[PDB]
Swiss-Prot record, chain A:
Its cofactor is heme b. It holds the Pfam family Dehydratase_hem. Optimum temperature is 30 degrees Celsius. This is Aliphatic aldoxime dehydratase.
Curated annotation (Swiss-Prot), chain B:
An aliphatic aldoxime binds at S228, H329. GO terms for molecular function: lyase activity; metal ion binding. The keyword GTP-binding does not apply. The active site is at H329. Its cofactor is heme b. It comes from the Bacteria. InterPro entries: OXD. The substrate is directly bound to the heme iron. Changing S228A: Retains 23% of wild-type activity with Z-phenylacetaldoxime as substrate. This is Aliphatic aldoxime dehydratase. Optimum temperature is 30 degrees Celsius. The keyword rRNA-binding does not apply. Belongs to the heme-containing dehydratase family.
Amino acid sequence: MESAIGEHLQCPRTLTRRVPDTYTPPFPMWVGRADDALQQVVMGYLGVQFRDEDQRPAALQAMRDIVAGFDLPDGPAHHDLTHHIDNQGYENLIVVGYWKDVSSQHRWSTSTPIASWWESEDRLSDGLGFFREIVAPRAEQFETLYAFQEDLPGVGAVMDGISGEINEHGYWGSMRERFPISQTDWMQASGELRVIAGDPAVGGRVVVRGHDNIALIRSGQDWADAEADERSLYLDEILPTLQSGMDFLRDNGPAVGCYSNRFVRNIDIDGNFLDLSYNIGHWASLDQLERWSESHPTHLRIFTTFFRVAAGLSKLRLYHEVSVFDAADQLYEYINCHPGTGMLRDAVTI
Amino acid sequence: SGLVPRGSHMESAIGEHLQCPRTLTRRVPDTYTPPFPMWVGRADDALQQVVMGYLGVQFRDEDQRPAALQAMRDIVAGFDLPDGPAHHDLTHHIDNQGYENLIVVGYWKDVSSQHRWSTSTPIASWWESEDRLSDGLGFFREIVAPRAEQFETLYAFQEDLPGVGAVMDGISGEINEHGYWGSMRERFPISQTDWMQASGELRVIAGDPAVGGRVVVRGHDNIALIRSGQDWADAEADERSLYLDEILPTLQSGMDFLRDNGPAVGCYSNRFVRNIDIDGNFLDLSYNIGHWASLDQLERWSESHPTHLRIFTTFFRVAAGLSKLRLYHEVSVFDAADQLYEYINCHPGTGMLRDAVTI
Ligand code: HEM
Ligand code: HEM
């Protein structure tokens, strides 16, 4: 059987799996593949925040400027746009871009068209909140799991292609084992989430410094091609419980180790909803994310439903990507966002 | 250290004399902290190998009860003899064939003393007697012997340990290795170096289940036996309701599933049994006795089946203010040579008889 860890990233283990190498998964799953050219990716989540209905035109146009900036040299290899209303009632458009290396994203960010737009005084007088949550896991610091083989969303889009049926899945602890670095490293968290510039209670520019081995999960649902029955299976049977789980993490973040939970729905360039959604969740450690997914009733119910219905899924597309990062490989900037926005909520003030 | 140790300063499930350099690691960092306290049986190097002897009486007809209850009283009286078990308890259950089963379980602190007991005249002559074939009652002996490295215990209470805990020296402080899937495995001292993999098949080596009479089944390497218990006898009303209204119906469902869908998941035998006194009156204590094809298969069921997951989450939700409701378990693995499954006039679906190969 094929391994989730790419050939060039396999090495002598100093840490072992929780199942023997004879283990056989209960159903097929697939991972994203990439050769040694893919060393470190950049996942850049770029947000526009607004409270009122009359702010929408300005917000959508700002989103369109950001997307136009991707056509410039060194733009992201892939991107998608989403919408959500957070628990303070604020609307958030988020553009996620994926780069294949660190230096391209740096060149892109620092280029005059992009850096000037960002550093501009207008951003302080548009009435809108802006943020950038940019994280850069090495190849060994992320894993992908797909219940499908074709047209990979998320970070899978910037990888080479799809693996065969992989071994390391279908049990709790399998996620950890799909991180190549888990062969040698505990991905243990240390440090605090801290403001290093500004004051969230005052608005304006605020910078938050991440700490080592914060985790980021993008877990997605794509029901766009689903027929009536499968449409109803996901939307009427699975989602209600997923919704409940997303609400819990959103409103009970501190209690379980979740810095920020977002349940977003994809949009087109004009801001119409598409039939894909996903979770963007930031975690104080990977093992807290492990503890929630394996113990909380909401996830446990959908997990079980999946086991029951997996063989019969035809068009419903489910997947995740999970990441951990060094302190230095994280950047979280907020301009005029409300104090509960993303990494602002739990960041210790200076 | 501090008044309340945490992380790597917390006590280990693994007895001090049984700790070694690991070749197989845990699935959590050493800084891991359990969300609630749990405890384990402690024993020094004097305890090397225990014997768990599950002794059975089986019947189907109403008029066999006094004959069954008397046969049980006799097996229990045999425990008063020299080299008897250090602890015992008696249970009743009806299997999926409608047959009633009385099981007495004895725990020994060492292998040889149980052997001196099994062979001693009053016991051996009772077992081998041809009267057992004509009494009308079914009889069985499911005697397993795990080494200290080959069983783990977990208690959500600190006092009066039931099962194999009763024959150990005492209770640990807060242990680190619980609260996640895979922690059961990690509580086995042998898990430090061994994968506890199963090999070989369950085989009839004497007699024939279909005919009846005497049948002897040989176990294979690393069969797993779990006893997972519930004690609500001394609980106040609210915790009695918690267990009987909120936990028991889905626990029952889950046991029914394992009882009736064994082969599909690798559970050779599953029994859900209620404790009784010597007179056959029910007590407010029960447990599962489940023999499994492998520890991995028990692991797979418990972490994925909606019945176990449901009650697992209920415990997580009530754990903080549990006061008198008592839940625990013990899980063992054995070498093929440390297992004995004997059956006299039991129906072909009893214990290891059901899934054994023949000839
Ligand atoms: C409604 C959509 C979802 C379904 C049907 C579902 C179901 C499942 C299933 C079946 C697995 C086991 C995967 C395997 O190894 O084969 C799994 C893993 C996992 N899921 Fe979900 N899930 C969903 C959404 C989410 C979300 C939104 C999160 C974010 C908290 C999440 C967190 C996790 C984590 C952390 C794992 C890894 C468990 C481990 O291997 O230790 N899932 N999910
Ligand atoms: C009173 C009903 C039960 C409740 C409330 C319950 C709850 C739980 C809890 C909370 C744990 C985790 C303990 C910890 O590590 O902190 C656990 C573990 C486990 N339970 Fe149960 N349980 C029950 C009955 C059973 C039964 C009858 C079985 C028999 C198959 C079973 C099989 C297992 C297994 C194999 C584990 C080990 C999980 C692992 O660490 O991988 N449980 N149970």
